[PDB]
Amino acid sequence: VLVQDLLHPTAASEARKHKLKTLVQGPRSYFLDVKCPGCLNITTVFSHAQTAVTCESCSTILCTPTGGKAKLSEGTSFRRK
Amino acid sequence: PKKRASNGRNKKGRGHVKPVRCVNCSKSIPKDKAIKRMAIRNIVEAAAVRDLSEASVYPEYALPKTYNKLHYCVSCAIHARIVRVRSREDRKNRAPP
Amino acid sequence: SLPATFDLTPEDAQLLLAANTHLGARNVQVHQEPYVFNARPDGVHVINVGKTWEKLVLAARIIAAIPNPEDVVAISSRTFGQRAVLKFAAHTGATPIAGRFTPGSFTNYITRSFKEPRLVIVTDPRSDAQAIKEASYVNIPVIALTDLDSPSEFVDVAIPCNNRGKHSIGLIWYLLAREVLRLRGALVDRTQPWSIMPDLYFYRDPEEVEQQVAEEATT
Amino acid sequence: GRVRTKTVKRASKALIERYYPKLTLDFQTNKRLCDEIATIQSKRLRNKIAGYTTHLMKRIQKGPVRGISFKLQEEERERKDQYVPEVSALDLSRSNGVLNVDNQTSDLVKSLGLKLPLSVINVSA
Amino acid sequence: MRAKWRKKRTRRLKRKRRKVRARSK
Amino acid sequence: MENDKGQLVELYVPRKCSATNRIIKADDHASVQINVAKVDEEGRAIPGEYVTYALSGYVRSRGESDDSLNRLAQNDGLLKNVWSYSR
Amino acid sequence: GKGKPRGLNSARKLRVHRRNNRWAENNYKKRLLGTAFKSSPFGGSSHAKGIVLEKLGIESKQPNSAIRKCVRVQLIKNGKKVTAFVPNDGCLNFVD
Amino acid sequence: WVPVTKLGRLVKAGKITTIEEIFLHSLPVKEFQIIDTLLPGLQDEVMNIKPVQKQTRAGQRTRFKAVVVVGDSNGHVGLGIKTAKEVAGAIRAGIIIAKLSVIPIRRGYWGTNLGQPHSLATKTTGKCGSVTVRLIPAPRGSGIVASPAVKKLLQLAGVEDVYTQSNGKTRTLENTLKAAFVAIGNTYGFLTPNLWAEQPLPVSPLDIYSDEASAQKKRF
Amino acid sequence: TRSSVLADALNAINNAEKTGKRQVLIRPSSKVIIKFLQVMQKHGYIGEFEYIDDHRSGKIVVQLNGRLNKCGVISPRFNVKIGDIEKWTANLLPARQFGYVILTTSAGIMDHEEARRKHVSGKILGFVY
RNA sequence: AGGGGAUCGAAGAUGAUCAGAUACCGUCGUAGUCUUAACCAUAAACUAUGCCGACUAGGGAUCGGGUGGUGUUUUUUUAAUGACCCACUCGGCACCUUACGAGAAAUCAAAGUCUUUGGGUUCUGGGGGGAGUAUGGUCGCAAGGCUGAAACUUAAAGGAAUU
RNA sequence: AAUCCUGGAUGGAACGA
Ligand SMILES: [Zn+2]
């Protein structure tokens, strides 16, 4: 305080900030590659999905919407990619 | 050349809160202001309890208590209640005792 | 540039950690203290003892820069620091003020508690606030044994510590005296740990005064 | 009312401050000593001062008193005033040779310091 | 006097005056 | 502060607080001139040789004298520690 | 933002504001409406001749006590009746 | 004299000779005899004396408040305001306080650079109470364009040419003069480009020759 | 609803200079801000400054040095003939021998001394001292 | 204007008090108090602080939402959820401390960034009375609202603080 | 060795310079 590097802040101080109030704004959300136990196809699923996303092969439920992050269904394979 | 007169300062009010009535004078006062207390008292004075325990069946008997919430207007509280009057500095204090 | 002799030795670290100087504040760290190290769970924060030591060495360098040692004033209104400041002024040439401060000591001539120091040392700035204020009135620097909760207003160099315990305060005073003696002393630095026990400081309570009166009575 | 005034109390305080190895607990010899020792202009003041010195001597004998110091109490203080025990509370031999730090403290030590005895516990709420 | 009651006074006066003027008009 | 014929004028060129590069005037009684010692080997702080730092009543009041001093001492080279530029 | 408009094309608002607010100083209102020529027995004149109707003793205002020896005067150009003060001890005898 | 307040010792010893060192190191003065030694050419002036009344059970304690301005016309002024039950004592103690509160004045040029400055270096402002006093630099020959009180203060400051522009209730001299005093004190608290060159922070004489003139005992 | 990004910038700078800080972040950015700061930099009133390229409008981090007393903004940006720079400079500068009025001309944003030398005039933006 | 009409209760009637008391206190109590359909449109309608926007000090707590945590508990020891705890965050009702500032002060994180006077914009005031009256228009069933002078008079009226 | 405990109020008349 009274002197600091506003261009090179710490990642710890930058990750706790609001997404818009960072030095350069950007999303804290992400995409998942998801496979249910039944099939072995991958479905790309957004973390904040807003829809009851289906697996096109087995017309089943994968994620149910919430206020923020989507709630993934019972135990499935999910990546962050 | 319009001309006018006095005018006056201010306390943080709300909006609107419904009024209650003072338990002594019946004055309508809003609940935010409305000096409030809780009279929790045994039915019997602290000395009659011995006589009544001696005279009562049902050992330990219960000794219940009567509870009532009292709302006082400012005037009645100042005339009776422990509210009394304070200096500029002490009247910023907000703790019970 | 300080040589590598004036570095943090493991025996001094042992002393500090045993005194629990590194235990910060449950309640709050004021933003002007970034002396924290990854706060302990279910409670307090942790202080960087290396930063503590290096600030302490700065303060010692200042005290040694003071030409006349009697122009260094050691304040303590806390009971935990009175023994420390008295024995500190004994070892050094400083002048202590333990107990009450009698406002008008840095200002206020003809009164007889009048002192014109070039430096002022304080254990707790919150409990010794009057002295910081007077010093700001009359152009005096400050050395303050701050915790992480203590106010940083009108304090120059702040030594992060724990001002809750006897041992922390007394030990910080011990190390300050040790270093201001190593500098401008007859002591050469390393091989001599200065055979003066830290418990010469560390306020003894009246119950233990009574216990050791009983000891003197026994034998 | 029988409250003593500041002239009396201050004179008694001074007489105790610098004539404590005298001044028996008896009003009579304290009174004659006040005559011997102080230019008091009146018998009544002399006797009041003697009475208050006697009172202070009594409540000195049954324990210390605040405000006063007569060089015997002081040399007794600075006789005590320095207790350097057989072993400090900062040696760890009073303990088991090691120092019972927590995880974050051990991390601090790993960061700045060097080899140091320790043993870890993980206390919580 | 209290401004409330001065206002009430002038109002009663005002409607008296309206009526007395309607007498002519 | 100088006239045409060189011949400097304006008595009392004042001091500048180093944390803010701001003038410290005569009535600023909360201002401080810290005086740090220069050591050599053996310890032995060298009485008479100094490293000076002036601070102002503003900084001392607002509570940043300690951080300012940490920075100044560090970049003058007597700490390889406390002050980090990236808070 | 200081209430008034600072915009480069706000001069109309500014000057009409002035026009409406100049009617709160007494001098401007007097000048413009015309009160000298309508009211004010001297029709914006410095002096006026008049015929003395009567002599008068006006009792002074408090806390003073005296009688001031004025005259009731009828003006020639208006016919207005007017009280006027005769100074300078005597001079009520020099008027008739 | 028998001085205390180490500056007094240094001054009675005669090692500090100028007030510029005192100002440079911001040393707090507590004895008027210091500057009476260092500045014999100082002269006083009583601006106003007014009574102030405290109401009591019996009557009115009427005391007298004196405003005194001291200066030499070489860049030093002081202002003292003191209330006492006698006019002479008020004036005496006000002269003391005015000596004790002495500030320097940065008197510079209006447009260009000839000898021996005549005006202020910057437009300055001071406020006490409602009163704001603005001092504006003026060209040569303009004189001091101000009311008589501020004019006399600026004369005793040695400001030859200056304009003033005031606001507020200027019919209260205490606040008017204090505002003016604050302005001419603020003359130095203004970074101009000529005062951008960094300097090596001189050492205080109070630290140079301490043991020379510290407080020693002389038992016999 | 910002109206003058420059005004917001210079209020931020003025406030930090008062507070004693040595750096300010100002958003959004603009060509006018960059040129104004370049003028202040040329005359030494501030240090370097760094334009962060978010894809929106920009941020700027200015490293300032304490030499600044007030940077300000004249809104509305009045039209200024060469006869009137004297009046503006007298009104809103502390002295004749330093301080700079900034104005926008067909030749560019610059100080009034440069405008005198180039013999041009324009629209007034602010002042620096 | 219909309905409803328990309670309290402008008016009124009465008992008392009082020098008087068609006032305070007491007992009755019409309109009203409730509702439906329409009118009125004012209030110390008060955070007497206009809205928008940016910056500038610390601290903790709280409402709503979100994130993270081998966290606690309830479960089915142990899973999810739910409720809690810790850290963070956005947005709100506010609060404590201080004055770098501001202010006439009282006080103010806005009443600050304002003689180092300019972010945008609307409304209102220009000593006190007369007078928010008269008059004219306009709205209204009316009560009244909105708009709104002048003559004449006057050196003080007023605001914060002090003893 | 026996042994259960308490905090809390009101109260008429009194105009003027
Ligand atoms: Zn009541």
PDB file of N, CA and C (backbone and C1' of nucleotides) in Angstrom, chain I residues 1-4 7 11 14-15 18-19 21 69-70 73-75 78 88 127 129, chain J residues 51-58 100-101 112-121:
ATOM      1  N   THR I   1     -22.986   5.649 -16.572  1.00  0.00           N
ATOM      2  CA  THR I   1     -22.936   6.685 -17.593  1.00  0.00           C
ATOM      3  C   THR I   1     -21.849   7.694 -17.317  1.00  0.00           C
ATOM      4  N   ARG I   2     -20.625   7.281 -17.593  1.00  0.00           N
ATOM      5  CA  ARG I   2     -19.520   8.204 -17.749  1.00  0.00           C
ATOM      6  C   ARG I   2     -19.835   9.177 -18.870  1.00  0.00           C
ATOM      7  N   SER I   3     -19.307  10.392 -18.753  1.00  0.00           N
ATOM      8  CA  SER I   3     -19.377  11.373 -19.822  1.00  0.00           C
ATOM      9  C   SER I   3     -17.995  11.818 -20.260  1.00  0.00           C
ATOM     10  N   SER I   4     -17.055  11.921 -19.324  1.00  0.00           N
ATOM     11  CA  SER I   4     -15.680  12.302 -19.629  1.00  0.00           C
ATOM     12  C   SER I   4     -14.751  11.295 -18.965  1.00  0.00           C
ATOM     13  N   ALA I   7     -11.954  13.073 -17.451  1.00  0.00           N
ATOM     14  CA  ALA I   7     -12.273  13.611 -16.144  1.00  0.00           C
ATOM     15  C   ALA I   7     -12.134  12.555 -15.069  1.00  0.00           C
ATOM     16  N   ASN I  11      -9.360  12.835 -12.098  1.00  0.00           N
ATOM     17  CA  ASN I  11      -9.777  12.765 -10.709  1.00  0.00           C
ATOM     18  C   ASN I  11      -9.069  11.640  -9.976  1.00  0.00           C
ATOM     19  N   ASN I  14      -5.403  12.751  -9.430  1.00  0.00           N
ATOM     20  CA  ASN I  14      -5.338  13.792  -8.417  1.00  0.00           C
ATOM     21  C   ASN I  14      -5.546  13.220  -7.022  1.00  0.00           C
ATOM     22  N   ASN I  15      -6.487  12.290  -6.881  1.00  0.00           N
ATOM     23  CA  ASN I  15      -6.790  11.736  -5.573  1.00  0.00           C
ATOM     24  C   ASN I  15      -5.651  10.880  -5.056  1.00  0.00           C
ATOM     25  N   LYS I  18      -2.838  13.079  -3.942  1.00  0.00           N
ATOM     26  CA  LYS I  18      -3.133  13.561  -2.601  1.00  0.00           C
ATOM     27  C   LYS I  18      -2.861  12.498  -1.555  1.00  0.00           C
ATOM     28  N   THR I  19      -3.215  11.255  -1.853  1.00  0.00           N
ATOM     29  CA  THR I  19      -3.095  10.184  -0.877  1.00  0.00           C
ATOM     30  C   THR I  19      -1.655   9.715  -0.708  1.00  0.00           C
ATOM     31  N   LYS I  21       0.082   7.809  -2.818  1.00  0.00           N
ATOM     32  CA  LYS I  21       0.377   6.643  -3.617  1.00  0.00           C
ATOM     33  C   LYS I  21       1.296   7.008  -4.769  1.00  0.00           C
ATOM     34  N   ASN I  69       0.897  18.392  -8.442  1.00  0.00           N
ATOM     35  CA  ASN I  69       0.033  19.008  -7.444  1.00  0.00           C
ATOM     36  C   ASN I  69      -1.428  18.847  -7.832  1.00  0.00           C
ATOM     37  N   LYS I  70      -1.772  19.263  -9.043  1.00  0.00           N
ATOM     38  CA  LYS I  70      -3.123  19.073  -9.548  1.00  0.00           C
ATOM     39  C   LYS I  70      -3.077  18.877 -11.049  1.00  0.00           C
ATOM     40  N   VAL I  73      -9.360  19.144 -15.424  1.00  0.00           N
ATOM     41  CA  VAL I  73     -10.138  18.971 -16.635  1.00  0.00           C
ATOM     42  C   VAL I  73     -11.079  20.149 -16.769  1.00  0.00           C
ATOM     43  N   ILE I  74     -11.093  20.752 -17.952  1.00  0.00           N
ATOM     44  CA  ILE I  74     -12.055  21.795 -18.282  1.00  0.00           C
ATOM     45  C   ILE I  74     -13.110  21.135 -19.156  1.00  0.00           C
ATOM     46  N   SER I  75     -14.252  20.905 -18.563  1.00  0.00           N
ATOM     47  CA  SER I  75     -15.480  20.491 -19.179  1.00  0.00           C
ATOM     48  C   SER I  75     -16.499  21.600 -19.019  1.00  0.00           C
ATOM     49  N   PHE I  78     -14.155  24.305 -24.090  1.00  0.00           N
ATOM     50  CA  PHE I  78     -14.430  25.557 -24.754  1.00  0.00           C
ATOM     51  C   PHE I  78     -13.518  25.757 -25.945  1.00  0.00           C
ATOM     52  N   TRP I  88      -7.013  32.334 -19.830  1.00  0.00           N
ATOM     53  CA  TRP I  88      -7.129  31.016 -19.227  1.00  0.00           C
ATOM     54  C   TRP I  88      -5.939  30.710 -18.336  1.00  0.00           C
ATOM     55  N   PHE I 127      -5.446  21.262 -17.468  1.00  0.00           N
ATOM     56  CA  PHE I 127      -4.307  21.977 -16.936  1.00  0.00           C
ATOM     57  C   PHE I 127      -3.505  21.015 -16.086  1.00  0.00           C
ATOM     58  N   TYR I 129      -0.182  21.086 -13.082  1.00  0.00           N
ATOM     59  CA  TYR I 129       0.825  21.751 -12.274  1.00  0.00           C
ATOM     60  C   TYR I 129       1.034  21.033 -10.951  1.00  0.00           C
TER      61      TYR I 129
ATOM     62  P     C J  51     -31.156  11.008  -4.616  1.00  0.00           P
ATOM     63  O5'   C J  51     -30.994  10.635  -6.146  1.00  0.00           O
ATOM     64  C5'   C J  51     -32.098  10.118  -6.858  1.00  0.00           C
ATOM     65  C4'   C J  51     -31.900  10.133  -8.348  1.00  0.00           C
ATOM     66  C3'   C J  51     -30.661   9.462  -8.883  1.00  0.00           C
ATOM     67  O3'   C J  51     -30.729   8.051  -8.856  1.00  0.00           O
ATOM     68  C1'   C J  51     -30.942  11.497  -9.985  1.00  0.00           C
ATOM     69  P     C J  52     -29.419   7.198  -8.515  1.00  0.00           P
ATOM     70  O5'   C J  52     -28.494   7.417  -9.780  1.00  0.00           O
ATOM     71  C5'   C J  52     -28.981   7.100 -11.067  1.00  0.00           C
ATOM     72  C4'   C J  52     -28.047   7.514 -12.160  1.00  0.00           C
ATOM     73  C3'   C J  52     -26.607   7.094 -12.012  1.00  0.00           C
ATOM     74  O3'   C J  52     -26.388   5.721 -12.250  1.00  0.00           O
ATOM     75  C1'   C J  52     -26.688   9.319 -12.744  1.00  0.00           C
ATOM     76  P     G J  53     -25.423   4.901 -11.272  1.00  0.00           P
ATOM     77  O5'   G J  53     -23.983   5.402 -11.685  1.00  0.00           O
ATOM     78  C5'   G J  53     -23.594   5.309 -13.035  1.00  0.00           C
ATOM     79  C4'   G J  53     -22.330   6.053 -13.324  1.00  0.00           C
ATOM     80  C3'   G J  53     -21.191   5.861 -12.359  1.00  0.00           C
ATOM     81  O3'   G J  53     -20.541   4.617 -12.488  1.00  0.00           O
ATOM     82  C1'   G J  53     -21.391   8.128 -12.852  1.00  0.00           C
ATOM     83  P     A J  54     -19.864   3.938 -11.209  1.00  0.00           P
ATOM     84  O5'   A J  54     -18.481   4.694 -11.096  1.00  0.00           O
ATOM     85  C5'   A J  54     -17.637   4.743 -12.226  1.00  0.00           C
ATOM     86  C4'   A J  54     -16.432   5.603 -12.003  1.00  0.00           C
ATOM     87  C3'   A J  54     -15.670   5.379 -10.713  1.00  0.00           C
ATOM     88  O3'   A J  54     -14.832   4.241 -10.728  1.00  0.00           O
ATOM     89  C1'   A J  54     -15.956   7.682 -11.066  1.00  0.00           C
ATOM     90  P     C J  55     -14.472   3.502  -9.351  1.00  0.00           P
ATOM     91  O5'   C J  55     -13.555   4.551  -8.590  1.00  0.00           O
ATOM     92  C5'   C J  55     -12.296   4.899  -9.127  1.00  0.00           C
ATOM     93  C4'   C J  55     -11.641   6.028  -8.387  1.00  0.00           C
ATOM     94  C3'   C J  55     -11.309   5.780  -6.934  1.00  0.00           C
ATOM     95  O3'   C J  55     -10.136   5.015  -6.752  1.00  0.00           O
ATOM     96  C1'   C J  55     -12.303   7.894  -7.155  1.00  0.00           C
ATOM     97  P     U J  56      -9.908   4.217  -5.386  1.00  0.00           P
ATOM     98  O5'   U J  56      -9.874   5.354  -4.283  1.00  0.00           O
ATOM     99  C5'   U J  56      -8.761   6.219  -4.168  1.00  0.00           C
ATOM    100  C4'   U J  56      -8.950   7.217  -3.059  1.00  0.00           C
ATOM    101  C3'   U J  56      -9.123   6.642  -1.664  1.00  0.00           C
ATOM    102  O3'   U J  56      -7.891   6.348  -1.037  1.00  0.00           O
ATOM    103  C1'   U J  56     -10.760   8.302  -2.060  1.00  0.00           C
ATOM    104  P     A J  57      -7.577   4.872  -0.501  1.00  0.00           P
ATOM    105  O5'   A J  57      -8.781   4.532   0.478  1.00  0.00           O
ATOM    106  C5'   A J  57      -9.209   5.457   1.461  1.00  0.00           C
ATOM    107  C4'   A J  57      -8.745   5.057   2.831  1.00  0.00           C
ATOM    108  C3'   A J  57      -9.079   3.647   3.250  1.00  0.00           C
ATOM    109  O3'   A J  57      -8.181   2.709   2.694  1.00  0.00           O
ATOM    110  C1'   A J  57      -9.567   5.134   5.015  1.00  0.00           C
ATOM    111  P     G J  58      -8.376   1.143   2.957  1.00  0.00           P
ATOM    112  O5'   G J  58      -8.012   0.990   4.489  1.00  0.00           O
ATOM    113  C5'   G J  58      -8.447  -0.142   5.201  1.00  0.00           C
ATOM    114  C4'   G J  58      -8.354   0.056   6.685  1.00  0.00           C
ATOM    115  C3'   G J  58      -9.111  -0.968   7.507  1.00  0.00           C
ATOM    116  O3'   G J  58      -8.418  -2.187   7.657  1.00  0.00           O
ATOM    117  C1'   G J  58      -9.678   1.170   8.257  1.00  0.00           C
ATOM    118  P     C J 100      -5.862  14.150   9.664  1.00  0.00           P
ATOM    119  O5'   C J 100      -5.538  12.902   8.737  1.00  0.00           O
ATOM    120  C5'   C J 100      -4.335  12.839   8.006  1.00  0.00           C
ATOM    121  C4'   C J 100      -4.542  13.204   6.566  1.00  0.00           C
ATOM    122  C3'   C J 100      -5.420  14.403   6.273  1.00  0.00           C
ATOM    123  O3'   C J 100      -4.726  15.623   6.464  1.00  0.00           O
ATOM    124  C1'   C J 100      -5.871  12.630   4.737  1.00  0.00           C
ATOM    125  P     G J 101      -5.505  17.025   6.420  1.00  0.00           P
ATOM    126  O5'   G J 101      -6.234  17.008   5.010  1.00  0.00           O
ATOM    127  C5'   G J 101      -7.237  17.956   4.727  1.00  0.00           C
ATOM    128  C4'   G J 101      -8.249  17.443   3.735  1.00  0.00           C
ATOM    129  C3'   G J 101      -9.534  18.246   3.681  1.00  0.00           C
ATOM    130  O3'   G J 101      -9.421  19.401   2.879  1.00  0.00           O
ATOM    131  C1'   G J 101     -10.067  15.968   3.889  1.00  0.00           C
ATOM    132  P     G J 112     -19.361  17.565   0.330  1.00  0.00           P
ATOM    133  O5'   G J 112     -17.996  16.813   0.623  1.00  0.00           O
ATOM    134  C5'   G J 112     -17.120  17.298   1.618  1.00  0.00           C
ATOM    135  C4'   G J 112     -15.756  16.681   1.525  1.00  0.00           C
ATOM    136  C3'   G J 112     -15.045  16.833   0.192  1.00  0.00           C
ATOM    137  O3'   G J 112     -14.303  18.029   0.100  1.00  0.00           O
ATOM    138  C1'   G J 112     -15.037  14.570   0.834  1.00  0.00           C
ATOM    139  P     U J 113     -14.129  18.768  -1.305  1.00  0.00           P
ATOM    140  O5'   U J 113     -13.367  17.712  -2.204  1.00  0.00           O
ATOM    141  C5'   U J 113     -11.999  17.440  -1.983  1.00  0.00           C
ATOM    142  C4'   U J 113     -11.430  16.538  -3.034  1.00  0.00           C
ATOM    143  C3'   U J 113     -11.632  16.972  -4.474  1.00  0.00           C
ATOM    144  O3'   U J 113     -10.688  17.947  -4.888  1.00  0.00           O
ATOM    145  C1'   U J 113     -12.152  14.676  -4.241  1.00  0.00           C
ATOM    146  P     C J 114     -10.921  18.819  -6.217  1.00  0.00           P
ATOM    147  O5'   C J 114     -11.104  20.309  -5.693  1.00  0.00           O
ATOM    148  C5'   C J 114     -12.044  20.601  -4.675  1.00  0.00           C
ATOM    149  C4'   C J 114     -12.741  21.919  -4.882  1.00  0.00           C
ATOM    150  C3'   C J 114     -12.357  23.057  -3.956  1.00  0.00           C
ATOM    151  O3'   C J 114     -11.167  23.721  -4.349  1.00  0.00           O
ATOM    152  C1'   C J 114     -14.719  22.926  -4.139  1.00  0.00           C
ATOM    153  P     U J 115     -10.235  24.434  -3.254  1.00  0.00           P
ATOM    154  O5'   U J 115      -9.739  25.769  -3.963  1.00  0.00           O
ATOM    155  C5'   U J 115     -10.539  26.944  -3.894  1.00  0.00           C
ATOM    156  C4'   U J 115      -9.999  28.088  -4.706  1.00  0.00           C
ATOM    157  C3'   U J 115      -8.872  28.878  -4.053  1.00  0.00           C
ATOM    158  O3'   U J 115      -8.004  29.382  -5.062  1.00  0.00           O
ATOM    159  C1'   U J 115     -10.638  30.322  -4.507  1.00  0.00           C
ATOM    160  P     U J 116      -6.464  28.943  -5.135  1.00  0.00           P
ATOM    161  O5'   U J 116      -6.437  27.883  -6.305  1.00  0.00           O
ATOM    162  C5'   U J 116      -5.250  27.163  -6.558  1.00  0.00           C
ATOM    163  C4'   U J 116      -5.504  25.862  -7.264  1.00  0.00           C
ATOM    164  C3'   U J 116      -6.802  25.156  -6.902  1.00  0.00           C
ATOM    165  O3'   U J 116      -7.283  24.407  -8.016  1.00  0.00           O
ATOM    166  C1'   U J 116      -4.974  23.818  -6.256  1.00  0.00           C
ATOM    167  P     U J 117      -8.159  25.115  -9.161  1.00  0.00           P
ATOM    168  O5'   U J 117      -9.546  25.427  -8.458  1.00  0.00           O
ATOM    169  C5'   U J 117     -10.499  24.397  -8.304  1.00  0.00           C
ATOM    170  C4'   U J 117     -11.820  24.889  -7.771  1.00  0.00           C
ATOM    171  C3'   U J 117     -12.974  24.935  -8.773  1.00  0.00           C
ATOM    172  O3'   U J 117     -14.191  24.546  -8.140  1.00  0.00           O
ATOM    173  C1'   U J 117     -12.683  27.054  -7.812  1.00  0.00           C
ATOM    174  P     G J 118     -14.929  23.180  -8.546  1.00  0.00           P
ATOM    175  O5'   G J 118     -15.422  23.421 -10.037  1.00  0.00           O
ATOM    176  C5'   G J 118     -14.628  23.047 -11.153  1.00  0.00           C
ATOM    177  C4'   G J 118     -15.456  22.415 -12.237  1.00  0.00           C
ATOM    178  C3'   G J 118     -14.748  21.367 -13.084  1.00  0.00           C
ATOM    179  O3'   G J 118     -15.668  20.338 -13.430  1.00  0.00           O
ATOM    180  C1'   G J 118     -15.499  23.115 -14.468  1.00  0.00           C
ATOM    181  P     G J 119     -15.915  19.114 -12.424  1.00  0.00           P
ATOM    182  O5'   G J 119     -16.521  17.979 -13.345  1.00  0.00           O
ATOM    183  C5'   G J 119     -15.976  17.726 -14.625  1.00  0.00           C
ATOM    184  C4'   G J 119     -16.626  16.547 -15.284  1.00  0.00           C
ATOM    185  C3'   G J 119     -18.087  16.704 -15.640  1.00  0.00           C
ATOM    186  O3'   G J 119     -18.311  17.460 -16.812  1.00  0.00           O
ATOM    187  C1'   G J 119     -17.796  14.668 -14.538  1.00  0.00           C
ATOM    188  P     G J 120     -19.434  18.604 -16.822  1.00  0.00           P
ATOM    189  O5'   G J 120     -20.781  17.807 -17.031  1.00  0.00           O
ATOM    190  C5'   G J 120     -21.008  17.103 -18.231  1.00  0.00           C
ATOM    191  C4'   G J 120     -22.241  16.265 -18.153  1.00  0.00           C
ATOM    192  C3'   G J 120     -23.519  16.992 -17.826  1.00  0.00           C
ATOM    193  O3'   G J 120     -24.058  17.714 -18.915  1.00  0.00           O
ATOM    194  C1'   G J 120     -23.387  15.024 -16.551  1.00  0.00           C
ATOM    195  P     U J 121     -24.683  19.169 -18.671  1.00  0.00           P
ATOM    196  O5'   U J 121     -26.050  18.866 -17.932  1.00  0.00           O
ATOM    197  C5'   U J 121     -27.087  18.199 -18.618  1.00  0.00           C
ATOM    198  C4'   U J 121     -28.144  17.673 -17.708  1.00  0.00           C
ATOM    199  C3'   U J 121     -28.915  18.688 -16.909  1.00  0.00           C
ATOM    200  O3'   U J 121     -29.891  19.377 -17.664  1.00  0.00           O
ATOM    201  C1'   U J 121     -28.312  16.895 -15.519  1.00  0.00           C
TER     202        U J 121
END
